[model samples]
Target: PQITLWKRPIVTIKIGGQLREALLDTGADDTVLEDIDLPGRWKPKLIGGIGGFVKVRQYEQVPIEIAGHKVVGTVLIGPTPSNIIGRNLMTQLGATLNF
Candidate 1:
């Protein structure tokens, strides 16, 4: 799907049969997902961005679909308000940031 230069580039994504909307962020390096129960193994991941730092769960090789395109990518589970689609999944989906 061709995105626009709107204030937000939000899209409905599929993960483990759960319906959720995420924001496509190019500045973010790792995908930060919400606190949803997932059936798989996970590891503790510490993420440090512009802010101080955050501890989250990293689930690798998880199934994720965006705009009907499916791809297995790593997802970090955090208790944030919205799930942020970072470059990790964006690269997998080949979603390049363009004008």
Candidate 2:
């Protein structure tokens, strides 16, 4: 028998002066930004989500630095009560997650 383990790139974001970490999951199709970390007045538009339509705004040419890697492009801003790093960002970084 054999045992194997792996790890992927973990990105960090600054939310309300606090640093948070999220795993880079490219399996998703859209970017899921946490609402709790965002500015109170900066309410983006709501596009759609996994279930149905959501309150997500499309941000164009937004700068995002993940795992010391920087990427600038259009991203969807949504309300993530918890925290999750979805697929859209993984596509942007061209990264692969190992299991």
Candidate 3:
């Protein structure tokens, strides 16, 4: 099956070393990092949206194996109310959100 932006990835990845299940949302401008307990090893410099920027140093591009298909992508580092798989990735993959 072809990949679509709205289609959620078949597997979840770790955000700042903490595993999290995230919904792929093309509507978001930037990718969101969310999890329950983030690890100290993870650090990344987060770009500010309005004024302040978040500093995160560690993030991972986890390999996703889904339905006999494997893909790799980077995930943000932190836990928020919602972790969004933003438009950058969707556009790179040449897909559009369907759901």
Candidate 4:
């Protein structure tokens, strides 16, 4: 399915059995979510964003549902301005920009 790009491409997604809204950020290389309860061992990492950098917990093999499509991959939890569905997850969903 095609996604229209607005000021921010936002969509509803399910993660860790919780439903939340996220922005589709093509500029981000990895998916980043706000602080949430997730089951797994995570590694600490620093990621650069619009501002400076922020610390994040990188979790592997996280499952998320977007637009009714299920995708499993890496998800980063941290102090993000907003939940973002980055290229890694978008590619798996076969998402594309239309105008």
Candidate 5:
């Protein structure tokens, strides 16, 4: 299915049995989510954003379902303004932008 890129390509995604809204960011290399309880060992890392860098917990092999397509990969938890689904997972879902 084709996904339209609006002001922000926002969509509902399920992560770890929880549903949350996320922005589809083609420019982003990693998926970042708001602070949430996730099961796994995470590593502390710093991620650069629009303003600067913020600390994040990188969790590996996280299961996320976007538009019913499931993909297992890394998900970063931090003080993000919103949940974002980046190219890492978008590519797996065969998501393409349509102007």
Candidate 6:
């Protein structure tokens, strides 16, 4: 579906049958989701944002769906954001960012 320009590309996501809203952004390198307990084990991963660096829990490969398209990838669990799905997930989703 085509999204309107409103500062960021937004979306509704299904993470392992649980639903949440998120920011689908090319500005991010990886998906940074707010505190939501995900499947299995995860490791510590750090990231650099627009104006700062932050560390997060990296949950490797989970089924995250958008519009019935479910792509498997590592989702970095951070303590912030409503949520931000990044370029990493975008590539897999075959998003072209047709602005």
lDDT of candidate model 5 versus the reference = 0.84
Better by TM-score, candidate 6 or 2 = 6
Model 4 TM-score relative to the real fold: 0.86
Q: Give each model's clash number.
A: 0, 5, 11, 0, 0, 0
lDDT against the true structure, per candidate, is 0.85, 0.57, 0.51, 0.86, 0.84, 0.81
lDDT ranking, high to low: 4, 1, 5, 6, 2, 3
Across residues 1-99, which tens digit of lDDT does each residue of candidate 5 receive?
576554677888888878888988888898999946799699998998568779999999888888778888889998777788899888888777665
Candidate 6 worst ten-residue window by lDDT: 1-10
Residue pairs with backbone overlap in model 6: none
Q: What is the lDDT of residue 18 in candidate 2?
A: 55
Task: Single out the weakest 10-residue window by summed lDDT for candidate 4.
Answer: 1-10
Candidate 2 ranges beyond 4 A from true positions: 1-10, 14-19, 36-51, 97-99
- For model 4, residues 1-99, the per-residue Cα lDDT tens digits are 566554667888998989898988988898989857799699998998457778889999888998789988889988787898999999888877665
Residue-wise lDDT of candidate 3 within 15-49, one digit each (tens)?
A: 33455555566556655564444333455656545
Q: Which ten residues in a row have the lowest lDDT in candidate 2?
A: 1-10
Q: Output the lDDT of residue 13, model 2.
A: 57
The deviation in Å at residue 73 for candidate 3 is: 1.7
Determine which window of 10 residues in candidate 1 has minimal summed lDDT: 45-54
Put down candidate 1 lDDT per residue, 1-99, tens digits, no spaces: 888866788888889888888988887888887846678789998887557778898999999888789999899998766789999898999887665
Error of 2 at 68 (Å): 0.7
Pick the lDDT winner. Answer: 4
TM-score of each: 0.89, 0.57, 0.49, 0.86, 0.86, 0.84
